[PDB]
Paper text:
Prx proteins reduce hydrogen peroxide and organic peroxides to water and the corresponding alcohols, respectively, by making use of a thiol-dependent mechanism involving catalytic cysteine residues. Besides peroxidase activity, archaeal 1-Cys Prxs are moonlighting enzymes that also have a chaperone activity, thereby protecting proteins and DNA from damage caused by oxidative and thermal stress.
For TkPrx, it has been shown that two C-terminal cysteines are responsible for a redox-dependent switch between a dimeric and a higher oligomeric state, with the former mainly functioning as a peroxidase and the latter mainly performing a molecular chaperone function. Intriguingly, while these C-terminal cysteines are highly conserved in all other archaeal 1-Cys Prxs, the Sulfolobus Prx6-subfamily 1-Cys Prx proteins lack both of them and only have a single cysteine that is the CP, thus evoking questions about its oligomeric state. In this structure, 21% of the total accessible surface area of a monomer is buried upon dimerization. In contrast to the ApPrx structure, in which citrate was present in the active site, the H2O2-binding pocket of 1-Cys SiPrx was found to be empty. Taking into account the monomeric molecular weight of 24.7 kDa, we conclude that 1-Cys SiPrx mainly exists in a decameric oligomeric form corresponding to the quaternary structure observed in the crystal structure, and that a smaller population exists of a higher-order oligomer, which is probably a 20-subunit protein. Archaeal 1-Cys Prxs are characterized by a CXDWWFC motif in the C-terminal arm domain. Both cysteines are highly conserved in the archaeal enzymes and contribute to the redox-dependent association of dimers into higher-order oligomers.
Numbering used by the authors:
A (entry chain C), B (entry chain D), C (entry chain F), D (entry chain E), E (entry chain H), F (entry chain A), ...: 5 to 212
């Protein structure tokens, strides 16, 4: 049923421009960003793939793989990738899932009310253990911000490492900038231990 | 049932720090950003409200109102707002919906699998006619990027005005920068009319 | 539910390379051949479209329109048609229905057990009053015989005109060649009236 | 439920002019063409049986057996076969399934909407492993083209042998005649390996 | 649901060697004997039709029409009737219902457990108002006694005329021969009125 | 389903200002008073907590623990407790259950018809074996009488010790004051044994 | 279904020691206390009726009527009342509802898990408009505190008059004694208007 | 469903030795005793009919009709009645309902667990308005007491006339003999009006 | 489900003026008469208990125990028994089942349509093996005839001893007085053996 933050990504086998892929598991110690686009040979989706491929190594340096998805035939994916390689001079280095009929698209709630024929601009961020960490549904008509996906992976990974929480617009928070936040105390014992620290006992910040 | 892009925002009456509000309709020619946060007096949600209130007038200049939401009592909202006004020196100028029991939260799919006691960081963007235009589910542990919400409203509004589509990372697209994209042709007549224009017949760009 | 010989073709509105089309009715005094192919840019489907477009005027002279269908996006149809026009030097003159998600494909039983991602090579022959007259399911891996579709329309139309029935391999039947067959008698009165005519009372042939 | 291309032919035992027959299995390394006709002693069905029996050895040389079927009593089959042997001077050498009540006919979707009392002209092509390979529903009023059934078996068998796909109207394709087609590449690696071959990378042809 | 003695014969339209017939009503002031036989060109059913046609005028003199029924095609009926006319030298003067698929046969409970492909030897006697008066199910393997059907119509008609009841083996009852029986008294008043008449008060006989 | 007098308190794990607590069992030889209040930082609920904390040791001397509950976040509980400690000069020494979403509140029937957003003033008295002994639903708008809860525990405990029953307003009954009542006789043997004692045989009193 | 605070008391007609009574309505501008007891001639229930009848005029001075209820026959009620009048020297002046079978008892959730044969000590307080204002379930074995029921009516009535809320143990609150509490502010406008008043902005007290 | 005391006797039409009878209504101002017996020509049932017919006029003088019932054919009833008239010298003057199949017997719960083939000795007493007043199920093996049925009608009729209640074994009660009893008082007003009359206020007796 | 003649009395445990009783079994070699009355302190039920207690030893001499039942509390039973002992000068020597809520009363079909608050005057006669032998439903308003219950036990016991059947009004049958009846013959062999005995072969009488 549509997956949510905290649930494990559903077991499913998909057919991609790089062969078959077994989806939560073939990426079982990496993060990955599964993202949909309406269709191949549309212009906005092309700018998005250009941007992803140009920024691919920042995705690799954060140990995440990209994997796209659309309701177009896997031959059309190959012809789209070939057009991109030769007109925009960049090679799309990640797999694109072909799902006509939209079975995996419906399973992840990627078909909305405004088109019955194509996905929206969905983005799932799955971590190294396969849990769904972040969900974005952008509409057809505006492209996504790829640097915001990177910013979110950095923050999500820092959370797993340092057991902290990132502030808003991190690492550019207008109150504490680069600094991260201590997870608020759970009992009254723990809370009193942090009294008189800057801001308040529930709002304490460190640096990393 | 959980609303999706294109559907009208569900009729519902809510109780907020500014009184009662009738939700899709009291904002019937403005845009608004309905957004949830886990709970009052948590630190990350505080940085998010600080950032929203500091950037409030850019939201106003785009004709959108902000409206928050959490499973906390409306008295706790008032005490949170008062703490923010006097420690961070800024007045929270938008209403905060109080929903304990989580009835409106469950109706908008804001409760996920990782906490049974609080919303995630959901963001809905509703337009001047009440249709849901954009949906974001950020997890509890990372704060949101508020400038990305603004960027998306700008783009969504430009789409409604000029009947165009924005490229990725607009207005900073690595192929066409500020320029917007012509919606691809629908029939074979229309497609041939655009042959030999830069990129290809489905990928044509103008300026605004 | 899957249509059958004698039933009226189901009311449905489809989106094609020639715009919108209202399917049983926009062809309300013509015959038409609705036919599916697995996907654009596959090789066998290309030879089939070449053959159809080269033989288009024999279809027109029998008052039938062609209309194709596949689970590919309508932009991919336009790009396929453009590739055909410029590599094989022929212009595809009939509409191609775009149905991703496969809603109209499932409704006509065009998805079989051997691929979950594409139609088979289905062929429906609908007459001037919209009734389904003939159904062919060819598999993905062999192309269709287009002259056999023409042969069947000729025969089906002669049946409607002369109230006869065509023999096997007509107009090349190894017993009576060009000649057509009288519909066998229904009662015992009618049967005795035809006794001692060549072959037998149920097997009588004329010429047209 | 009505069988489709790729599914195995349903297990069923039938009573024929040659005794009992166990249907998918008694033909377990041969191909066979199961085909229905409306009824014995109708004229068009007679021309079809004449044509099948005259062409029987081309069916045998392709390792396929013929087997007919109708809602008529098995005594009426024998009397029809005897009439054919002595008026048209040819012996019907294949079994004819007798199914009054129409149980096997309904199971294979051979009864349509235009007669509640007889089958249509259905044709199933089953291969040496029992999978349904091709389905034809011709109406009562036009006879079938038997040479087209042979053409389809030849092509289907060549596909199983050479792992190719036949073009339209094969072996008489107006682009490549006798030549068969290479199955289009599945991944982007495989596609680039075939660049600059005649037609395009998805449309490559050999000879056999 | 299977008709029973006293119920009206179900409305149904059937297709016979004499054209269409509307079954309970086209015989709306006559009696008729609807009877099934397994199939045309079987030997026992032939002797039964011979016997019926030879005795046809005794059926006519009792104001009853005969009408047969089998799961064989109406062309096979005509060919059976023609074989009978020329080998046994008698013309079958009554209609034979053709019902392949067996829809009317199943509706009258004429298909039993010993053959799934043919009716048994059912006999229904319907009167001038359409009520089912008598039901016989003889098996495939023994022919019927036609003089017993006549004997039963005579008795059933005498019952309707004289308000009596016929004894066993009438008109040859081993106690009272030709004589018929008075319907036994219903109340104790009526019973005492008949005391001391021959046999007893419930068993009184007259002559006609 | 809503618990009742005599049933065991439902197994449930709750999150409180003192950590996790496993509810019927962590108190498995003590009594406890589970009680709800509408919300933190409301005035009447504050007076109730003041009164409970001031009288805490009378609760301890009767071997009962207090444990509160509200639909407010556990951080808001801590901030409420801190406000009480420093304005009313008393430390709240018992755990407060945090249940937003109201799952445990709905399970104990603590949400009524007059507010859909907060509990009423429910009071459950559970004994040393975990059975529900007494249930009070006070409305939002009047505070509870805490000395009446103590009076009821004293009486309930005396019942368990001496196998008696307390009179009305005990220990201040206007007929027998401090004295307790003998449980009325169950059979007619037992009843006659108590005849002519003061009041009557069903109404006998002792002292403790 | 079991009534709750805020719901209107269910329409029902009952048979009492004072005749028939139509329950929510015959008391349509008075308050009333409907209360159950296990059974007549039990000792604790007797002390409770004594106490109620002795304090009857304080109930009358607060415009409330008393009405009792038990699963005992209405003749047994009369004999119990007569025993009370002559042994305890007081006349029971209020009606007692007789409900054997327990239909009204089950409808108000007065039968619990510890006896399948008698009610518990339930107490409902209904106001002049028929809404259920307060619910008490005391167990069989301890009698009720009648002065606490009076205290609650006084408070509930003061709430309806002065739009206030009573503190805990009112009119004997250990913080503000006789004084009542202002209902906490609902919006942030209203809250700031009360800043710097004693205790805090949500905790303000007046006198009556 | 099985009728009970107070319900109206179910509408039903029955076939009896006196013709058709419409059961609750043809007796619409008389009382009647509907009674079953296992079967005709059993010995105990014969003694019961003898006794009923001999006492018939006491039944008539109380304005009640008798009507019997058994699962035996109505001819067997007539032959049983005739045997009784001539061996026991008495004429059975009441109707006997014939119900083979037992449809009316099952509807009145007259078939029990000890025989699946015959009724028990059921007795229903219906009054002048058709309500069921008294139900007796005697077993097969003991005959009924007919004078007790008369005694019960006398008492039931006296109740309807004088609004009283008869004592046990009336008119031979060992405490008050012929005298009848006043229906006990319903309210406490009415009860006190009868104090100090003989026996007690609920036990008062008059004479008729 | 409501018990019937021949079924075993349902297992059930009941609470009576003599303690607990396990109902079919604690009487496992005695007969017993379970009988209901509407309520204690009603006048007719009192006369019935007087009569039962005065005749108790005739019940004991037939090896049957009495046991009563009503929807009144077991304390009210004791007070009723005490009133009877001292006003009517007789001690009620049998147990009275207390069933408020009416669970055992509904299980035995003792609540009818004329009062929803009390049983009717039901009488069950159970034998030494626990089978239900006789069922009486007398209405509220007439008392029962206790000598008729005794008469029925005598007859039922004689049946078990001598394998006979008692005539009507036995031992005072107007045809054969004291004499009992031979159970009618079951087969035609047995019947002829009794021909020419007084009355007839099915009606033979002996003496005991």
């Amino acid at each position: 049923r549509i997956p949510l933050i905290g649930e494990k990504f559903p077991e499913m086998e998909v057919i991609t421009t790089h062969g078959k892929i077994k989806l939560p598991d073939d990426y079982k110690g990496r993060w990955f960003v599964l993202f949909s686009h309406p269709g191949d040979f549309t212009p906005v989706c092309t700018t998005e793939f250009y941007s992803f491929s140009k920024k691919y190594e920042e995705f690799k340096k954060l140990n995440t793989e990209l994997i796209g998805l659309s309701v177009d035939s896997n031959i059309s994916h190959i012809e789209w990738v070939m057009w991109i390689e030769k007109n925009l001079k960049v090679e799309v280095p990640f797999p694109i899932i072909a799902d006509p009929m939209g079975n995996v698209a419906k399973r992840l709630g990627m078909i909305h009310a405004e088109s019955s024929t194509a996905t929206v601009r969905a983005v799932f961020i799955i971590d190294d253990k396969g849990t769904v960490r972040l969900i974005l549904y952008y509409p057809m008509e505006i492209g996504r911000n790829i640097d915001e996906i990177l910013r979110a992976i950095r923050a999500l990974q820092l959370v797993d490492k340092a057991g902290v929480v990132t502030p808003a617009n991190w690492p550019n928070n207008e109150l504490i900038g680069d600094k991260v936040i201590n997870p608020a105390p759970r009992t009254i014992k723990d809370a009193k231990m942090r009294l008189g620290q800057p801001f308040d006992w529930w709002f304490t910040y460190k640096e990393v």
